[model samples]
Target: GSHMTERRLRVLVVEDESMIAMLIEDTLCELGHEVAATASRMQEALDIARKGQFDIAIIDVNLDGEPSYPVADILAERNVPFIFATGYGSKGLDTRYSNIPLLTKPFLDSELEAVLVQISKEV
Candidate 1:
């Protein structure tokens, strides 16, 4: 867990479910990361990604029944690390995002920690 102390990551959380979003925020806080912002809609997600300051982001792959690749697009251009949060288990992730990480729904704290650790390694 050395990476955990290397830096405190400021994370933007983008989930469509309010309860789930809160759960993630709590988990991140317990794990020593900060939630820079949270969004449950496409427009807000896009705006946050564009103007928000965060070291990384966990973005729901689907928002209001639409793919959230648009937000991911902005994150990519900003050179921010992003994890795609999805219920589909990454089986059909867009080919363009094959290299990006996926944080499947209903994950445990350890799962999130592992994902963040992996992202830290890449960064």
Candidate 2:
């Protein structure tokens, strides 16, 4: 048998809810990725996204009724890959960002791993 292992990634997590943020952090840790930072607001996320040296990000589409597209825009400009986790799924995403990978809300651990694997291949 053979085994494959990936290098640990520095991940940025942008989610408003405390429980969901913690859950994402735990999952990333379990998958061997370090959380560079977690932000609960658009400005906070943008500040980190601009300065934080992270390999990837997992963002919630909406933060307490506010859309998180600004954060996405900054990350895109920085060439940092990210996945959107949203209850609204792909339909909620803007056409401009429709191409990015989306992690539907209430996703399983395997699904999350799959997204990360796909990202690992790209970046």
Candidate 3:
């Protein structure tokens, strides 16, 4: 496959599950984007969120030991755009976050692609 542009989109991934994180990275790579960084724990996610010059993020709702809300909070504060990847489904999330673009477990690569496109359009 052809590689992404030199100016590929930069993305930060916040996921605790190793396999899932790898899958996400692979998909992002296939899409011609770059994974700016990845974090398995909340604190690390926060650190990456603050440091990485990412254009967007794909965050799981929960992290290593707690909910991923803090990471979401920092992303919001930084005005960084993102889409939530949650197994819980939007109904399970708080009302404040329900409307955010979300991808459920066992999601298709096309679905993720669409979500990212939607975010890019809105941002």
| Local distance difference test scores for all models | 0.54, 0.53, 0.52
**Which pairs clash in the backbone of model 2?**
none
Model 3 stretches with alpha carbons more than 4 Å out: 1-8, 36-39, 51-53, 63-65, 77-79, 87-100, 106-123
1-123: candidate 3 lDDT, tens digit per residue: 697546646656666566456655675766667454464566656654665445455556543344656666555544443444555543322223224555544456433653455553545
RMSD of each: 6.2, 6.8, 7.0
Q: Where does model 1 exceed 4 Å of error?
A: 1-8, 51-53, 61-64, 67-69, 73-79, 88-101, 108-123
Residue-level lDDT for 77 in candidate 1: 49
What's the residue-level lDDT of 45 in candidate 3? 66
Worst lDDT window (10 residues) for model 2? 89-98
N/CA/C clash count, model 1 = 0
What residue runs in model 2 are displaced by over 4 Å at the alpha carbon? 1-8, 51-53, 74-79, 87-101, 109-123
> Which model is ahead, 2 or 3, in terms of lDDT?
2
Alpha-carbon deviation at 99 in model 3, angstroms: 6.2
Weakest 10 consecutive residues of candidate 3 by summed lDDT: 89-98
lDDT of 2 at 13: 61
